[PDB]
C-alpha cells in the first residue's frame, strides 16, 4: 500500500501538473477564511455547477514576506499526495497578480469551531479523529513529508464527519533532520523551541497536544504570550483533567515525551506503538482508513520566481 502510494506520489512530485483551469471559469461566492497572503473563497465551477474552495495568494505579498519556497512547495505536495484524510486539489493556476489553488469544498467547517462550541469531545469522539491523524502521519512520514502544523484549525470535517487536512504551508520533504522555527506555539515540540535539529517525531508530539485539546477543551500548555507557553512545553510538566481515562493519560505521557528517544512514534516499532496502545484497542484501523466506522458527529464558517507553479 505504502510502496504503491510512494510510487504514485513520486511520479506526480517529479512531474507536477500546472495551469489546469482559469479565474473566469469560477463564480466567486463568499470568503470562508483568511491568511497572510490572501483568502479562501466558496466558489462555483460555472460549466458543471460544482462547488470548490479557492485559495487565492498574492504573489507580490508572498515575495514581500519571503515565503516563495514554502508557497511553491505547498501546491507541489497538494498535487502529488493521495489519501482520504487530505483535501483533494482539483486545479491550480496563476494570473498577473495571483496563485490559485482550487480544492474540494469541505462544508462541515473547522474542527476548531465544533470543539469551542461543544467545549470538549468525549474520549470515543476524540479517538475517532486521533486515528485519522495517526494514519495520515504514517502516510506522510513514509513519503518523507514532515507536516509541522497540526491543530484543530487545520482540520476540516466533511459530510461523512471525517477529517480533511487542508494546509501544507510548513510541510517539508526531508528524510532526516531540519531546523526551521515554524508551527503554532501551543503545538511546538520542545526540540523545535530549544532550537535543535529536529525530525518527524515533532508531528507525534503535536498529536499528543491535539488528543489532549480534543479531550479537555484546552491545550496542555497555554499562557498569554508564546514565550510563556515555550517554558511550559520545555519543562514537560503536564496536568491532566480528572475525567481523562488511565489509558488516555498513559498514551499522552508517551506522546508528550520531551525525550524523543522515548517518544511514541519515534521508537523502533514506530507508529505500531501508538496503534497497539490500550487507548486504541477498540479502533478498527482498516475501517477508519476505509471510512466504514460511523462518525460520532455529522455537521459552519465565520463571516469576513513562481515559474514552477
Amino acid at each position: 500500500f505504502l510502496a504503491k502510494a510512494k510510487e504514485d506520489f513520486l511520479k506526480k512530485w517529479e512531474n507536477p501538473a500546472q495551469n489546469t483551469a482559469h479565474l473566469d471559469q469560477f463564480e466567486r461566492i463568499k470568503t470562508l477564511g483568511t491568511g497572510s497572503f490572501g483568502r479562501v473563497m466558496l466558489v462555483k465551477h460555472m460549466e458543471t455547477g460544482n462547488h470548490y474552495a479557492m485559495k487565492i495568494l498574492d504573489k507580490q505579498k508572498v515575495v514581500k514576506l519571503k515565503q516563495i519556497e514554502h508557497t511553491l512547495n505547498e501546491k507541489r505536495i497538494l498535487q502529488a499526495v493521495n489519501f482520504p484524510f487530505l483535501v483533494k486539489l482539483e486545479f491550480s493556476f496563476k494570473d498577473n497578480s495571483n496563485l490559485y489553488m482550487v480544492m474540494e469544498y469541505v462544508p462541515g467547517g473547522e474542527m476548531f469551531s465544533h470543539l469551542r462550541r461543544i467545549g470538549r469531545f468525549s474520549e470515543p469522539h476524540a479517538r475517532f479523529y486521533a486515528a485519522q491523524i495517526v494514519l495520515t502521519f504514517e502516510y506522510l512520514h513514509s513519503l518523507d513529508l514532515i507536516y509541522r502544523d497540526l491543530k484543530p484549525e487545520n482540520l476540516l470535517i466533511d459530510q461523512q464527519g471525517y477529517i480533511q487536512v487542508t494546509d501544507f504551508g510548513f510541510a517539508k520533504r526531508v528524510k532526516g533532520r531540519t531546523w526551521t522555527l515554524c508551527g503554532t506555539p501551543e503545538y511546538l515540540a520542545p526540540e523545535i523551541i530549544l532550537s535543535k535539529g529536529y525530525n518527524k517525531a515533532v508531528d507525534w508530539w503535536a498529536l499528543g497536544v491535539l488528543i489532549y485539546e480534543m479531550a479537555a477543551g484546552y491545550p496542555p500548555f497555554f499562557a498569554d504570550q508564546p514565550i510563556q507557553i515555550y517554558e511550559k512545553i520545555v519543562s514537560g510538566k503536564v496536568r491532566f483533567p480528572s475525567h481523562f481515562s488511565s489509558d488516555l493519560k498513559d498514551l499522552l505521557r508517551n506522546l508528550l515525551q520531551v525525550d524523543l528517544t522515548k517518544r511514541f512514534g519515534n521508537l523502533k516499532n514506530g507508529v505500531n506503538d501508538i496503534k497497539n496502545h490500550k487507548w486504541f484497542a477498540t479502533t478498527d484501523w482498516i475501517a477508519i482508513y476505509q471510512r466504514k466506522v460511523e462518525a460520532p458527529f455529522i455537521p459552519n464558517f465565520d463571516d469576513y520566481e513562481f515559474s514552477e507553479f
Partner: peptide, 18 residues
C-alpha cells in the same frame, strides 16, 4: 480552574503560526 485559566489567557480563538 484550568478552564477559567484558559479563558484568562486571550488564546481561546484561532491561533496563527509563528
Amino acid at each position: 480552574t484550568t478552564y477559567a485559566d484558559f479563558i484568562a489567557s486571550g488564546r481561546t480563538g484561532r491561533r496563527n503560526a509563528i
